[PDB]
Design a protein around this ligand. Structure first.
Ligand code: 6IK
Lengths: 239, 201
């Protein structure tokens, strides 16, 4: 069966026909280890990123690209963020890059901030409930988004499959958090350009549209002071 | 000359200037992916020096990449004069339509580059995800040839580092595991004889 010819014939994207699309104690150990959710309204363009301390084990970076809406951030804006100044010497980044020039400019950003790309996580969008306008340079219909994983310093698949969200809904699939947390990378986790709707235990969320804040740098640091400084987020709490 | 054509050769040493211009180029190169090699790889410098630029004036390049070739392939694409304008991923399934480092890999990547100003192509007919069953190792899915034919029907195409199962109408396939030389396009036959009179490269 040729699902590409089938898409041409019917408008059902090939991913519509993927099927099926216990590490449960790990999920409970992650939940037990999670810091309280903390969050801060901040205009990241005008904000001294160095105020966010301590340095982070994981950064999830979700800048609002113009292609999500068909204040947006260009790759010019994003590339000038001083991410290396808040990343721990051994740390990870997950950068949502969209499906256009971001696949190139996001890799430039990663190298500029001192990371090497280790995984390319693809969010593949089905259209089972509505079997598309085109970017001028596009050759094909764009039905996916990429989240690049970078590493600096010394159970899951690289695919997320969900239905294409309703127009104007810019949310990324919550499954990205599951993937990240299952890596057991450390407990200092930062989500830049998060929203009220993405706030989550175990994470510090920083974004312009947050309606409330509870962030306190001293209180936050206290979650990771000894004996808790090097926990992976996947082990038991220390008595 | 529409029917399949091929040239057994080492792509490092063949003079590709004799083949003319193509609307679509596809390559699945043996990148040096800094792992143990079941085949002979091309060094980064050899990949960079590939005479890709002579093969097209206006058209599309499909470049399969993996590992750190995701970055090196972008470099080569740009050095050869292309802008990357799409990226196809092939989601690997079994016969039951289920998906087969830090993460398990369910997919393969194919960069799409454009050179010049192609006109008369059918952009946007297909989408950028392929779902298809895995055949042999290192074997790409036949769906890509259909997408490429719908995008540019009837034009001349060339595949680099192809294998005998890859030979198709409208395509000239170059690879070191093909069966001799098989050429039917008269312009190509002429320039081949002129450049290789004793039939050896
Ligand atoms: O290499 C390879 N398969 C041996 C050949 O023989 C065969 C037939 C023509 N090939 C040549 C190679 C050549 N020079 C090479 C050389 C160097 C040093 C000494 C001797 C020969 N010249 C003319 N044709 C190579 C090779 C290359 C790439 C891949 C992986 N992709 C398969 C992929 C497609 C979807 C999955 C994946 C892709 C990244 C996403 C696997 C194997």
């Amino acid at each position: 069966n040729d699902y590409c010819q089938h898409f041409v014939d019917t408008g059902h994207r090939p991913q519509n026909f993927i099927r099926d699309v216990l590490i449960r104690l790990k999920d409970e150990l992650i939940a037990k280890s999670n810091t309280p959710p903390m969050y801060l309204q901040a205009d990241i363009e005008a904000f001294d990123i160095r105020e966010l301390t301590p340095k982070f084990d994981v950064i999830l970076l979700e800048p609002p690209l113009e292609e999500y809406y068909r204040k947006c951030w260009t790759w010019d804006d994003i590339m000038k963020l001083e991410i290396d100044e808040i990343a721990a010497p051994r740390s990870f980044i997950f950068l949502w890059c969209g499906s256009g020039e971001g696949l190139d400019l996001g890799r430039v950003c990663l190298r500029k901030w001192g990371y090497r790309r280790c995984e390319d996580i693809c969010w593949i969008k089905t259209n089972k409930n509505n079997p598309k306008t085109l970017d001028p340079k596009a050759v094909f219909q764009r039905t996916k988004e990429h989240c690049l994983m970078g590493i600096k310093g010394t159970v899951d698949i690289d695919l997320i499959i969900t239905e294409e969200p309703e127009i104007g809904n810019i949310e990324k699939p919550v499954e990205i958090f599951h993937i990240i947390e299952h890596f057991c990378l450390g407990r200092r986790r930062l989500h830049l350009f998060g929203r009220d709707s993405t706030i989550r235990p175990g994470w510090l969320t920083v974004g312009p549209t947050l309606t409330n804040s509870n962030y306190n740098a001293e209180t936050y640091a206290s979650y990771f002071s000894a004996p808790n400084s090097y926990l992976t987020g996947c082990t038991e709490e220390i008595e | 000359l529409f029917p399949p054509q091929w040239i057994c050769c080492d792509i490092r040493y063949l003079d590709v200037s004799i083949l003319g211009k193509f609307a679509v180029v596809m390559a699945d190169p043996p990148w040096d992916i800094h792992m143990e090699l079941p085949y002979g790889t091309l060094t980064d410098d050899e990949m960079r020096r590939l005479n890709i630029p002579v093969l097209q004036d206006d058209g599309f390049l499909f470049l399969w990449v993996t590992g750190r070739a995701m970055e090196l392939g972008r470099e080569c694409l740009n050095l050869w004069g292309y802008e990357r304008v799409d990226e196809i991923i092939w989601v690997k399934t079994n016969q039951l339509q289920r998906i087969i480092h830090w993460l398990n890999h369910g997919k393969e990547h194919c960069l799409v580059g454009v050179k010049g100003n192609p006109q008369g192509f059918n952009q946007g007919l297909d989408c950028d995800v392929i779902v298809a069953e895995v055949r042999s190792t290192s074997h790409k899915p036949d769906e890509i040839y259909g997408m490429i034919e719908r995008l540019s029907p009837g034009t001349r195409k060339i595949e680099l580092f192809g294998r005998p199962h890859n030979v198709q109408p409208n395509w000239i396939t170059l690879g070191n595991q093909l069966d001799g030389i098989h050429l039917l396009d008269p312009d190509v036959v002429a320039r081949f004889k002129q450049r290789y009179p004793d039939g050896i490269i």
